[PDB]
């Protein structure tokens, strides 16, 4: 039989230290192709090892298609091929868009749903998985208004995370590294930051905040590990909740939720399943 492997690369939709992401075509359908830098080969190996262990399938997890290694004259080429989401990243989308109550809740509940799916061990099933680099650039927006979580290159089953989103126990190096629940609690911290980024863009009473990344007001661009440790660990700062949120029942509830993802004590933080339940009871 014919195995039509050929993917056509059409347009570059992202370039970084990781490598590049392209919109490609396979058999008349868009696919996303991540081409890894030599610098980041371990991320390809880790995501490939995870998908060889468990074929995750969930509407809020970026859909796997293929992992390809191709021998070149003097190098190895590494591609990850996934579903393509033409609306792009949540980071991209929030710059560009304000939200209403329904669209804000649908975004955050879809992220919580993908995250709880990663975190839960299913017997018969899947191992429990922590993401370890959750952020708005690692979330894609789908046409149906839900999101999906991308990039399992740092994931752990039972490179460091983006410093802006690191939990206090990562920055102060107290994290219990032999305890898998520690990694779930680091993802919950990061989720709370994402929830804050999104909520800012939800309109209430004709008011909205401009898009800003977490801690925009207290650290530089490309903040150092020390910059983040001083804010998060030493001073114990948390993102600002604007007064205008307290006139809106949805934003009032989301402010409480994000506070319960940001406790200094990792074991006090809400679980992804508890976050889901709370979000289903808002509005
Ligand atoms: C090698 O590389 C790539 C291959 C493909 C691809 C193209 N046509 C057909 C296939 C196919 C799938 C599944 C079977 C099954 C059929 C049932 N039987 C009991 C076991 C075997 C056979 C063939 C594939 C996998 C796409 C790629 O990119 C999207 C590839 O490159 C990454
Ligand atoms: C990698 O990705 C894609 C692959 C394909 C594709 C191409 N040829 C053959 C297959 C296939 C056929 C049959 C079996 C099964 C069915 C019965 N079972 C009991 C055992 C064997 C598995 C696989 C597929 C899935 C299509 C895709 O899109 C339409 C793909 O996505 C881009
Ligand atoms: C985060 O991580 C990964 C993401 C993706 C991915 C999947 N669908 C779509 C995209 C995308 C498409 C289009 C735009 C822009 C371009 C045009 N316009 C200016 C606005 C929209 C942005 C982004 C991406 C980047 C794939 C990945 O792997 C294959 C990723 O790595 C795991």
From Swiss-Prot:
It comes from the Eukaryota. GO terms for biological process: activin receptor signaling pathway; acute inflammatory response; atrial septum primum morphogenesis; atrioventricular valve morphogenesis; BMP signaling pathway; branching involved in blood vessel morphogenesis; cardiac muscle cell fate commitment; cell differentiation. It is linked to Fibrodysplasia ossificans progressiva: A rare autosomal dominant connective tissue disorder resulting in skeletal malformations and progressive extraskeletal ossification. Heterotopic ossification begins in childhood and can be induced by trauma or may occur without warning. Bone formation is episodic and progressive, leading to a debilitating ankylosis of all major joints of the axial and appendicular skeleton, rendering movement impossible. It is a single-pass type I membrane protein. Its EC number is 2.7.11.30. Belongs to the protein kinase superfamily. TKL Ser/Thr protein kinase family. TGFB receptor subfamily. GO terms for molecular function: activin binding; activin receptor activity, type I; ATP binding; BMP receptor activity; cadherin binding; metal ion binding; peptide hormone binding; protein homodimerization activity. Keywords: ATP-binding, Disease variant, Glycoprotein, Kinase, Magnesium, Manganese, Membrane, Metal-binding, Nucleotide-binding, Phosphoprotein, Receptor, Serine/threonine-protein kinase, Signal, Transferase, Transmembrane, Transmembrane helix. The active site is at residue 133. It catalyses: L-threonyl-[receptor-protein] + ATP = O-phospho-L-threonyl-[receptor-protein] + ADP + H(+); L-seryl-[receptor-protein] + ATP = O-phospho-L-seryl-[receptor-protein] + ADP + H(+). Bone morphogenetic protein (BMP) type I receptor that is involved in a wide variety of biological processes, including bone, heart, cartilage, nervous, and reproductive system development and regulation. As a type I receptor, forms heterotetrameric receptor complexes with the type II receptors AMHR2, ACVR2A or ACVR2B. Upon binding of ligands such as BMP7 or GDF2/BMP9 to the heteromeric complexes, type II receptors transphosphorylate ACVR1 intracellular domain. In turn, ACVR1 kinase domain is activated and subsequently phosphorylates SMAD1/5/8 proteins that transduce the signal. It is found in: Membrane. The chain holds residues 202 to 499 of 509 of the full protein. This is Activin receptor type-1. Interacts with FKBP1A. Interacts with FCHO1. Interacts with CLU. Interacts with type II receptors AMHR2 and ACVR2A. Interacts with BMP7. Interacts with GDF2/BMP9. Interacts with BMP6 (when glycosylated); the interaction may induce HAMP expression. Interacts with TSC22D1/TSC-22.
